[PDB]
């Protein structure tokens, strides 16, 4: 690992600088180096890791969607043969995206999840595992497609099971997990009714628990609740 010689604290400090500079690839490399020190992550450190990789893969997914759309139109009836270039470049971006997902899934499996015993860490990491299998599922076409989809479902489901037993319905990790699992149902599993039901039940159970919160906790919970409502509005 190219970060093996840097102090853990220096990697975390530089990840924060990279975030301020919007250098998300650097941020992700710094956080990968920090994870590879072998120590458990704090709440803030898990946030840095997830923000870094979400921004890297988010850019790759956006580029992949542009290229896939161009490829789909180049294959329609009446379109002119442009050669292999659109497919090749879509494949190049796809392979890079898959590489980033495999890296994140590798950090989670070696060994973040197995050492995560508190709900707030274990649910967070299982949510990430579902997210990165979901990104793989977005591009999957081969023999293992259904197993990729089920790996996302399984990770999200274990996270849901722990969050329902161990976290209040307003916990932002629990809310974000439900938001993303609902999107998995809608976009990956072809299950829009399950997506809508999960978003609605999550929103309503959080609403009923807001009265227990401080103003700062209320702001965090209602932010994610608004995203659930936004998706419900898109879908209904």
């Amino acid at each position: 690992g190219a970060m093996g010689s840097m102090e853990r604290a220096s990697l975390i400090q530089k990840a924060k600088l990279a975030e301020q500079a919007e250098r998300y690839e650097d941020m992700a490399a710094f956080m990968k180096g920090a994870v590879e020190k072998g120590e458990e992550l704090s709440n803030e450190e898990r946030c840095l890791l997830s923000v870094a990789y979400k921004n890297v893969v988010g850019g790759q997914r956006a580029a992949w969607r542009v290229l896939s759309s161009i490829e789909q139109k180049s294959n329609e009836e009446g379109s002119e043969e442009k050669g292999p270039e659109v497919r090749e470049y879509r494949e190049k971006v796809e392979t890079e995206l898959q590489g980033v997902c495999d890296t994140v899934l590798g950090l989670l499996d070696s060994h973040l999840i197995k050492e995560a015993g508190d709900a707030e860490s274990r649910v967070f990491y299982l949510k990430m595992k579902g997210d990165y299998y979901r990104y793989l599922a977005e591009v999957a076409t081969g023999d293992d497609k259904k197993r990729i989809i089920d790996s996302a479902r399984s990770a999200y489901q274990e996270a849901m099971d722990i969050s329902k037993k161990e976290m209040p319905p307003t916990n932002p990790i629990r809310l974000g997990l439900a938001l993303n699992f609902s999107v998995f149902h809608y976009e990956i599993a072809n299950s829009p009714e399950e997506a809508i039901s999960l978003a609605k039940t999550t929103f309503d159970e959080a609403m009923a628990d807001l009265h227990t919160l401080s103003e700062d906790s209320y702001k965090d919970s209602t932010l994610i609740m608004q995203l659930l409502r936004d998706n419900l509005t898109l879908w209904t």
Partner: peptide, 6 residues
């Protein structure tokens, strides 16, 4: 288009 995820 991206529905909202966090």
């Amino acid at each position: 288009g991206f529905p909202a995820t966090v």
